[PDB]
Amino acid sequence: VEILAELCPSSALAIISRWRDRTFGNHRSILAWTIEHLVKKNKINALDALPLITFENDWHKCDLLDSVLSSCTDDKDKIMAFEVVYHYTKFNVQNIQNLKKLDAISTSLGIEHTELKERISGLQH
Amino acid sequence: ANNQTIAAITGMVEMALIQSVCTESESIQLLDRYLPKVPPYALTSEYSKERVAYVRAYALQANLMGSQLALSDLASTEVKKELMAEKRHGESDDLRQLKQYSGVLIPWYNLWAKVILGKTRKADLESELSDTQKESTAIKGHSYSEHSLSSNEIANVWFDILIEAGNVSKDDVENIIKWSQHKGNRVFTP
Amino acid sequence: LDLFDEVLKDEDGDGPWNEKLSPPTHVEDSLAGYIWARLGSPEAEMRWQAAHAVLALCRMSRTCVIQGIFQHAINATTLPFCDRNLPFYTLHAQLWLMIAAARVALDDGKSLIPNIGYFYHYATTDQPHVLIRHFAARTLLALHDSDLISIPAQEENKLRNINQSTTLPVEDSYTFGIDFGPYWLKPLGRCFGVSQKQLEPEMLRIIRDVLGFKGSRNWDEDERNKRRYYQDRDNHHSHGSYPRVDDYHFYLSYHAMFMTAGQLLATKPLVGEDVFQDWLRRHDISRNDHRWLADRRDIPPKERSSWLNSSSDNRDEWLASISENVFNETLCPSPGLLTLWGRWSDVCSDRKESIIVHSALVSPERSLSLLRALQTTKNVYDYKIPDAQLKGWIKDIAEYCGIDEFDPWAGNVRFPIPEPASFIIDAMKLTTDKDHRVWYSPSDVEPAMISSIWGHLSGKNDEEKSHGYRLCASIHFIKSALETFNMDLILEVDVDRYSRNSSTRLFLFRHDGTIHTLYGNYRN
Amino acid sequence: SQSQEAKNALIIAQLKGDFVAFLFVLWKALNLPKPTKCQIDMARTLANGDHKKFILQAFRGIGKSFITCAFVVWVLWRDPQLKVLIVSASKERADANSIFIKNIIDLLPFLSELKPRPGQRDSVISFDVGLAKPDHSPSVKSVGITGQLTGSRADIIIADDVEVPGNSSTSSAREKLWTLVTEFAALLKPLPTSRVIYLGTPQTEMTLYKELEDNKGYSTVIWPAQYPRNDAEALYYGDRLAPMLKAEYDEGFELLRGQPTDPVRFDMDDLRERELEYGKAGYTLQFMLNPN
Ligand SMILES: Nc1ncnc2c1ncn2[C@@H]1O[C@H](COP(=O)(O)OP(=O)(O)OP(=O)(O)O)[C@@H](O)[C@H]1O
Numbered sequence A: 001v002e003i004l005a006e007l008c009p010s011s012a013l014a015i016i017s018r019w020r021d022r023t024f025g026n027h028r029s030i031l032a033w034t035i036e037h038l039v040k041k042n043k044i045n046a047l048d049a050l051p052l053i054t055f056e057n058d059w060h061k062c063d064l065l066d067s068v069l070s071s072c073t074d075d076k077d078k079i080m081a082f083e084v085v086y087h088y089t090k091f092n093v094q095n096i097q098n099l100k101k102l103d104a105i106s107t108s109l110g111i112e113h114t115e116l117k118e119r120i121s122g123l124q125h
Numbered sequence B: 001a002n003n004q005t006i007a008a009i010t011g012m013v014e015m016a017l018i019q020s021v022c023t024e025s026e027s028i029q030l031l032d033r034y035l036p037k038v039p040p041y042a043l044t045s046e047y048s049k050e051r052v053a054y055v056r057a058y059a060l061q062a063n064l065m066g067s068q069l070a071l072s073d074l075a076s077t078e079v080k081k082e083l084m085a086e087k088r089h090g091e092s093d094d095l096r097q098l099k100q101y102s103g104v105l106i107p108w109y110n111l112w113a114k115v116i117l118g119k120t121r122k123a124d125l126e127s128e129l130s131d132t133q134k135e136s137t138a139i140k141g142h143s144y145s146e147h148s149l150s151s152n153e154i155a156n157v158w159f160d161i162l163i164e165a166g167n168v169s170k171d172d173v174e175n176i177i178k179w180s181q182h183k184g185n186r187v188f189t190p
Numbered sequence C: 001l002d003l004f005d006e007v008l009k010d011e012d013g014d015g016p017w018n019e020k021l022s023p024p025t026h027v028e029d030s031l032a033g034y035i036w037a038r039l040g041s042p043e044a045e046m047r048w049q050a051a052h053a054v055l056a057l058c059r060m061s062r063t064c065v066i067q068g069i070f071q072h073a074i075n076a077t078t079l080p081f082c083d084r085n086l087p088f089y090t091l092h093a094q095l096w097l098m099i100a101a102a103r104v105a106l107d108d109g110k111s112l113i114p115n116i117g118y119f120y121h122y123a124t125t126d127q128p129h130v131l132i133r134h135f136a137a138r139t140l141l142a143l144h145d146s147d148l149i150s151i152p153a154q155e156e157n158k159l160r161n162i163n164q165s166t167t168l169p170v171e172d173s174y175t176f177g178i179d180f181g182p183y184w185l186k187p188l189g190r191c192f193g194v195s196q197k198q199l200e201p202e203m204l205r206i207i208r209d210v211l212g213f214k215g216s217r218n219w220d221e222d223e224r225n226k227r228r229y230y231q232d233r234d235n236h237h238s239h240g241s242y243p244r245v246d247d248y249h250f251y252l253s254y255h256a257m258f259m260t261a262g263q264l265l266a267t268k269p270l271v272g273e274d275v276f277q278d279w280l281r282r283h284d285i286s287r288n289d290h291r292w293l294a295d296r297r298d299i300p301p302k303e304r305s306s307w308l309n310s311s312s313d314n315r316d317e318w319l320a321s322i323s324e325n326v327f328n329e330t331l332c333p334s335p336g337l338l339t340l341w342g343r344w345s346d347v348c349s350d351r352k353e354s355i356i357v358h359s360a361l362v363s364p365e366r367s368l369s370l371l372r373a374l375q376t377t378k379n380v381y382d383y384k385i386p387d388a389q390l391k392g393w394i395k396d397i398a399e400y401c402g403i404d405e406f407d408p409w410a411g412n413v414r415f416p417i418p419e420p421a422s423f424i425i426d427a428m429k430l431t432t433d434k435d436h437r438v439w440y441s442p443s444d445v446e447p448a449m450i451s452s453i454w455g456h457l458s459g460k461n462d463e464e465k466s467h468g469y470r471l472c473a474s475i476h477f478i479k480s481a482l483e484t485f486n487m488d489l490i491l492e493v494d495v496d497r498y499s500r501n502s503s504t505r506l507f508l509f510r511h512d513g514t515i516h517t518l519y520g521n522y523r524n
Numbered sequence D: 001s002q003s004q005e006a007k008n009a010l011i012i013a014q015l016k017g018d019f020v021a022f023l024f025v026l027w028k029a030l031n032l033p034k035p036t037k038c039q040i041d042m043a044r045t046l047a048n049g050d051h052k053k054f055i056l057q058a059f060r061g062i063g064k065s066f067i068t069c070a071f072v073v074w075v076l077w078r079d080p081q082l083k084v085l086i087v088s089a090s091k092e093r094a095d096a097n098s099i100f101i102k103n104i105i106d107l108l109p110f111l112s113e114l115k116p117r118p119g120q121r122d123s124v125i126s127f128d129v130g131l132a133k134p135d136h137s138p139s140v141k142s143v144g145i146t147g148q149l150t151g152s153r154a155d156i157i158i159a160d161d162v163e164v165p166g167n168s169s170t171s172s173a174r175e176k177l178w179t180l181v182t183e184f185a186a187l188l189k190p191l192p193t194s195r196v197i198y199l200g201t202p203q204t205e206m207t208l209y210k211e212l213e214d215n216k217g218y219s220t221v222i223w224p225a226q227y228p229r230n231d232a233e234a235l236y237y238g239d240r241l242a243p244m245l246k247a248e249y250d251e252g253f254e255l256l257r258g259q260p261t262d263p264v265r266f267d268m269d270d271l272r273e274r275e276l277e278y279g280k281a282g283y284t285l286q287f288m289l290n291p292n
């Protein structure tokens, strides 16, 4: 999957879309692998790739958010990115190492989620 | 598992009978020494290697004593008591297994044993065969699976009955070929 | 790569190379094409995920991908992103694109301006498909209300009346089965006094000539059914229920019904003050304020201490030895706050607890009799503390639901969660937000009441987990309410326990700040 | 003069004495053709008070809902003090049932006496007949399975095909539904005359209509669409088949093979297209009631 995505992006996005009609490989996380490898090799912009997390896969969301924070200088964009990631992460369980990273990024942006404080304190054991 | 003793003993008995080397009392004594009295496990597992040998051996022992084999002979205690009940709507799964995997073969091996002993001959074979093919199918019920082994077994016992009867013809085998063409009548390459 | 030419057959992959499989040049067109192909999926959850993806794109400045999506929508492209052998559901993709746009336009719709000419193509009465007209008009009016565009007054008057019954002064073997006919076509025909046999000939014309199918009704006309992609009866339905997976005959009948309905408004008067809207809203999203159910979901509340500490206890006694302690947690989640209404369950690997709470108002002198009267009983299921003198106070959750019940991100919630009856809101001058989450007094800074709901949408062959809903209020508010309605408060709690592989009490609250039971009194 | 009064008295006694005549009168009033043989047998079996824990199984489209409505309206026509509970799959169905009950009450002449008195509580969810006293529980209550079951006691309980693909597709759904069905028995009043009835059609391999029989001790009767299709299919039910069908099939067992049980409504060519709409498994599940 990674070599095919790296060799020609526009062809790979069509091919993996036809595979899902054929149900070839529906037990694997193909889309996450393809998108993250294209982000790493600088062939697609991170702000284009971030909204795809609404499709349920084994994403590494903090790596995508870090790629967004390291790339764009506009103060609006990182605020919006944090909002989107936080909302579509909120409802299912997480370990403390994720929550503390999100808290630190929130302190850097200049927002103080008491909700995040309480939800991380409730697991501090 | 796959203790080969029953098949070897049965083959020896068949060979001794067909050459008129031994008496029937000797055969009864020898089969009685080896057949278990309680029914063995393999009668209700469709992939146990032993099943066909036991079915053949019990049918031959039954026909040597002038009987005909029935389902109640192979049955264990619980299902025998079930077959002595009357007011039943139910039917246990370990009974349907014995009907599905062993029951359909009882009409065939009785005719096979009758031909072996010389009690049924070429001059009236077809009336038996056309009856037997009915009598099996009434027991058969719903073969909803395409993976049934029973067609492959029935073809073998049918061909053996023809070859043992004598003076076969091309059309007789072509009947087996024609029967194989319907759905579910699968015959494997060996 | 040519070492494989002696074993590659046809029907390996898509088949031999043909130029119609060529991908687009820019990457963003391919990403837009992936999302476009997922909008047309036969499974509902994927369509809702793609709708959320489009909504997430429009809340950013992501111009190129959005313009790519609308370009694919205009051209109705199928093949480079779809299998050559399986049919594609175009109209589902267009309908869910309208559903996404209608929600984008409510908050900040500016991103929709450069493609405005798309919506004008569908918001006219010479387009016979009812729902697509409906959502296109809802998008245009929402942009008009936000002062992003300006619409002339007669055009506004036409758009606001798009499905009015204006025309008041005025062989094939295909069959509609044992469930689609009687439960889907008959209620439509009942609006005009027409039986479904009289309206089948228009449906057959629409199927054979517009949608273009020309086969028979047999179950093996669908390739996905022949190859056994559907499993465990996902595509079965009955008594007007929706399926989980849309098979091909259902797709055809579903769109043919809405194209049939558009002709009857143009030719025939209806029979009774408007019956058509009450039919149409059966096939719409669940909320009257055009928001989604996904906006109502909250995270689970913090756990009760007795649950954590009692998790270690041995099981058989735990099913039989409910302490009094748990009830003190149920009435008071946190200091200064009381539970007014609620019903929920808490789940672990071996055990589950169920909790129910009720509250009502009773005349001050008669309350002292009613406290003894309710507890002296043979049974507690044969009578009920009521809801909107013993008098009701709160109205309970609604039962009805819309088509967004299959959205994975809405955890099977229902929107009208409990709230006070109208006269309490009027007399106490309360105000609230757009989702009725928090209520404020006209005189204090702290909230009067807080409501919440939580849960998950269950998949196949999976465990249950914790869910429920709750309403809570501050003590100051209920004291003021009791001093101005001049009443005493009676409330009741059930706790029950079950295994995985009831104890009932009542409390009476009085405005001097005291709680009374048959057995004892408690204070702050 | 007197002859018509004698006719009126005899007819109004007879209709309270015979369910089948009441069905004929009602179906003439609805302008529907005469009830078929299976419908008569189903109504007659339902009317007998000796079945206390009872399940009836029948193929799709036979007429279960109309029979249920005529039953409950006839029952309250004979005794207006009874408490009746109607449980259905969903809100839409419960509303349709209650509306149809009101339509039957208004359609026939004499049943107009059952119209409620001031203080009506003439709601769509629950209501009283006029001859009932002011009382805690209502005469008729109609509810969906997810709705408000709690808060009353019932004398007669009717279940109108609760198990549905829309509510039994997941493990959680089946477990919830199993809890609700196995909780109804506490609602029933403990007088000797109380009774509960299920009507429905199995939808899956697991069906609660079998669970209630194998453990809880209920009794069931079955009407298949056509006479048994082979010997082994016939061997599936001997105690379960309706007495008319078994009584015929013991005798003409070769000519009756596969013949339709109700040719007045369902000919062979009308059953064949059902076997084209659905696979042979689906047809056997829904019309022969033999889950494989
Ligand atoms: N003898 C008859 N002749 C003609 N039409 C009839 C007859 N009996 C009933 N019907 C009509 O056919 C339908 C059968 O009733 P109904 O749909 O309630 O059956 P059902 O058993 O509840 O159905 P299902 O299994 O689909 O839920 C009704 O519309 C009824 O008016």
Ligand SMILES: [Mg+2]
Pocket: D064, D065
């Ligand atoms: Mg019905």
